[PDB]
Scaffold this motif. Structure first.
Motif, short mmCIF file in Angstrom:
data_model
loop_
_atom_site.label_atom_id
_atom_site.label_comp_id
_atom_site.label_asym_id
_atom_site.label_seq_id
_atom_site.Cartn_x
_atom_site.Cartn_y
_atom_site.Cartn_z
N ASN A 52 30.92 73.72 14.31
CA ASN A 52 31.99 72.74 14.19
C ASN A 52 32.32 72.08 15.53
OD1 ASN A 52 32.16 73.35 11.49
ND2 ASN A 52 33.95 74.68 11.70
N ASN A 55 29.39 68.48 20.32
CA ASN A 55 29.76 67.14 20.80
C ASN A 55 31.22 67.11 21.24
OD1 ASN A 55 27.20 66.01 20.43
ND2 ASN A 55 27.64 65.44 18.31
N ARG A 57 34.37 66.75 24.25
CA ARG A 57 34.81 65.75 25.21
C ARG A 57 35.54 66.33 26.41
NH1 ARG A 57 37.36 60.56 21.85
NH2 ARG A 57 35.38 59.84 20.97
N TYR B 15 35.64 59.42 3.61
CA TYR B 15 35.05 60.65 3.13
C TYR B 15 35.49 61.81 4.02
CZ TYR B 15 31.60 61.17 6.87
OH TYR B 15 30.98 61.37 8.08
N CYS B 19 34.06 68.74 9.48
CA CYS B 19 34.74 69.60 10.44
C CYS B 19 35.90 70.38 9.84
CB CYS B 19 35.24 68.77 11.62
SG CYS B 19 36.79 67.88 11.32
N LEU B 20 36.19 70.20 8.55
CA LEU B 20 37.29 70.93 7.93
C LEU B 20 37.06 72.43 8.02
CD1 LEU B 20 38.04 68.77 4.80
CD2 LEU B 20 39.77 69.61 6.36
N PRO B 22 36.63 75.95 6.87
CA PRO B 22 36.29 76.43 5.52
C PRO B 22 37.31 77.37 4.91
CG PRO B 22 34.88 77.44 7.17
CD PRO B 22 35.59 76.32 7.85
N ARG B 28 40.02 70.08 12.13
CA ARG B 28 40.04 70.25 13.57
C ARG B 28 40.92 69.17 14.21
NH1 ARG B 28 34.57 69.37 17.12
NH2 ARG B 28 35.55 69.27 19.18
N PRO B 32 34.70 63.71 17.07
CA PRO B 32 34.31 62.29 17.14
C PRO B 32 34.52 61.53 15.84
CG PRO B 32 32.63 63.70 18.11
CD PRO B 32 33.57 64.60 17.39
N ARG B 33 34.23 62.15 14.70
CA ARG B 33 34.28 61.43 13.44
C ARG B 33 35.70 61.07 13.05
NH1 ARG B 33 29.77 58.92 12.41
NH2 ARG B 33 31.28 58.17 10.86
N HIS B 35 39.84 61.60 14.33
CA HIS B 35 40.70 62.00 15.43
C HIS B 35 41.93 62.74 14.88
CE1 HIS B 35 38.32 58.46 16.46
NE2 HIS B 35 38.30 58.90 17.70
N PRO B 43 30.62 53.26 8.32
CA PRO B 43 30.60 52.00 9.04
C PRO B 43 31.30 50.91 8.26
CG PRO B 43 28.45 53.03 9.10
CD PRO B 43 29.27 53.80 8.12
N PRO B 44 31.95 49.97 8.95
CA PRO B 44 32.69 48.92 8.25
C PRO B 44 31.78 47.91 7.56
CG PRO B 44 32.65 48.44 10.56
CD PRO B 44 32.01 49.79 10.41
N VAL C 64 23.95 57.48 10.49
CA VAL C 64 24.51 56.93 9.26
C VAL C 64 23.76 55.66 8.90
CG1 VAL C 64 26.80 57.94 9.50
CG2 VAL C 64 26.32 55.74 10.56
N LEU C 65 23.85 55.28 7.63
CA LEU C 65 23.23 54.05 7.16
C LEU C 65 23.96 52.83 7.72
CD1 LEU C 65 22.53 56.24 4.79
CD2 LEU C 65 21.85 54.17 3.58
N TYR C 66 23.20 51.75 7.91
CA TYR C 66 23.79 50.47 8.24
C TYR C 66 22.78 49.37 7.96
CZ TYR C 66 26.63 46.98 10.60
OH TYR C 66 27.40 45.88 10.88
#
Ligand SMILES: [Zn+2]
Lengths: 86, 49, 144, 82, 148, 144
Positions: A52, A55, A57, B15, B19-20, B22, B28, B32-33, B35, B43-44, C64-66
């Motif tokens: 977990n 990566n 910081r 989604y 990092c949840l 278990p 957390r 990065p994914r 905050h 992605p937008p 990821v896809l893009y």
């Protein structure tokens, strides 16, 4: 005569060593420059490295320092079952 | 009609982050994914709405 | 010369390398760098990563896809990820607006054509329309 | 490589097994004759592997294939470089 | 008393040849699943960029195609069949294209399945079908298609 | 030959057997098998069951009304429930797209016409338009 075997990971964390001094970091300042040292692995500025926590910081400045050597401290427990006949 | 009256907007789907925790089922504090929020994003996609 | 850059010219070579599965590095303007990749398995589609550092036990890339646009590839500069150099320690980057003086003591503007160095680390620069080399001091970084 | 290691023997027992069916004993009767069998290696009926017990009661059936079971649990650490 | 065989519009699978043709500037036609059939082109001149047109016909003196800049996606090319616009045409929208497995009734009243290897046409515009293992060319009505 | 299948051809025979009250098995496409039955008593109407296994002390079939369509009966294959065989252990099912090579080393496609075996269990297959028998290896299962 290993009847069965199993492995378990208890801890998996990163520890840093100075290339020349041979010491392990324990403390850093607000700028994240090294303040203290130890010659004991059991007491070091451990960075978690489980699935977990990858990566991170917190220690980007520390990583880029060429004087430091990251080390992957990993602790394991392995169970082995023996059948030795009669 | 929709393209006319709408405004340009970035649509990014949601989604649950891996990092949840278990066991507790809560996220957390920093990754990065996401905050601290327990939900990450893709992605937008440019869209008019 | 310096081996810190090896840009790809043809998009065809880029697609050929993508078919081989090798990762690419794609620069941006006033924005973070990007890594691009072709997904493995049955279904083939482009994937991207905002991370840049090398994979390690303590650092893993996220994909990821893009719907990557060919316009970005053809326009922006592209490199092989493994062979890219982070920085060349020079005052002025390549393709940067600079000012200088000509041989007849006339001031003129130009962009950097080549970045060079000697064995002692002294850096020489060649400008567009000027075959001779220029010192770092002799150049001037023009403000945008 | 290894930075530190230690080995200990958590258990040391004798497991009973049938010669024909090959299944180990699970449950037994009042005299400790077999009433149930199991395919598991660990759940099987077992007794401490020391001479005193052996002298203190093989005794149940002629299917004379006991199995000395020894469990090794090892603690170790590594410092793998980059 | 007939017309020679007509080639089918070969779909292009390899992305590399697609990109090479595009770089050469040859027009491409993309069959989008959701929103119909479109043309794709590389802009001429120094300012290179991809362009799209829905002026979905062969270029003609009286009908000149208009090209709009668009950010065509690689995934779009990969997942969608693409054809050269020089080939794909209304000329022959054959019900049973080449390499298609079709069911045909044989003279012994036993239905067999064969793959169409060659197709041609005649004065009336009929679709003569050639099936592997037989020389006589069948007609549209006799044949049948089996799907899934 | 093998006695694992005895399909009914005429719908008239199907209706005759339904009048006799014997159960039927009706196949489906990419879907579960069905059993069909005529209700007893004063009122006559069709009934269906999603269960397939034989009735026993530990297993009982469930029957409900349904407006069964004659189209299904006439089109889909039908068998007597009691005499149906679950499976014939062959690589290729009957009426399946297959590929082979002709006598002149020409490749051709076909569907299986008959499924056969010898006394030793070796399985031979006959294709449409081919009187001779083919080995299991010589055939190839065509992908949909
Ligand atoms: Zn997260």
């Amino acid at each position: 005569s290993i009847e069965k075997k199993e492995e378990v990971i208890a801890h998996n964390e990163v520890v840093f060593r100075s290339l020349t001094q041979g010491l392990y970091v324990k403390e850093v300042d607000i700028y994240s420059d090294v303040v203290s040292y130890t010659k004991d692995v059991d007491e070091a500025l451990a960075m978690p490295n489980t699935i977990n926590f990858k990566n991170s910081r917190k220690y980007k400045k520390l990583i880029m320092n060429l004087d430091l050597e990251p080390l992957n401290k990993i602790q394991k427990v392995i169970y082995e079952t023996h059948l030795e006949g009669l | 009609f929709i393209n006319d009256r709408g405004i340009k907007v970035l649509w990014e789907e949601a989604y649950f982050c891996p990092c949840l925790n278990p066991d507790t089922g809560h996220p957390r504090v920093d990754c990065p994914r996401c905050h601290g929020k327990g939900i990450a994003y893709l992605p937008p996609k440019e869209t008019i709405m | 010369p310096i081996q810190d850059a090896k840009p790809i010219d043809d998009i065809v070579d880029i697609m050929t390398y993508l078919k081989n599965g090798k990762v690419l590095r794609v620069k941006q303007d006033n924005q973070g760098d990007i890594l691009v990749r072709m997904s493995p398995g049955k279904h083939k589609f482009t994937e991207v990563s905002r991370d840049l550092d090398k994979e390690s036990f303590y650092y893993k890339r996220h994909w990821v896809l893009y719907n990557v646009s060919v316009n970005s590839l053809i326009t922006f500069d592209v490199y092989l990820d493994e062979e890219y150099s982070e920085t060349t320690k020079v005052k002025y980057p390549k393709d940067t607006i600079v000012e200088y003086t000509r041989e007849d003591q006339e001031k003129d503007v130009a962009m950097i054509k080549e970045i060079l160095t000697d064995n002692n680390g002294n850096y020489f620069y060649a400008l567009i329309g000027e075959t001779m080399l220029f010192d770092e001091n002799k150049l001037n970084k023009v403000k945008d």
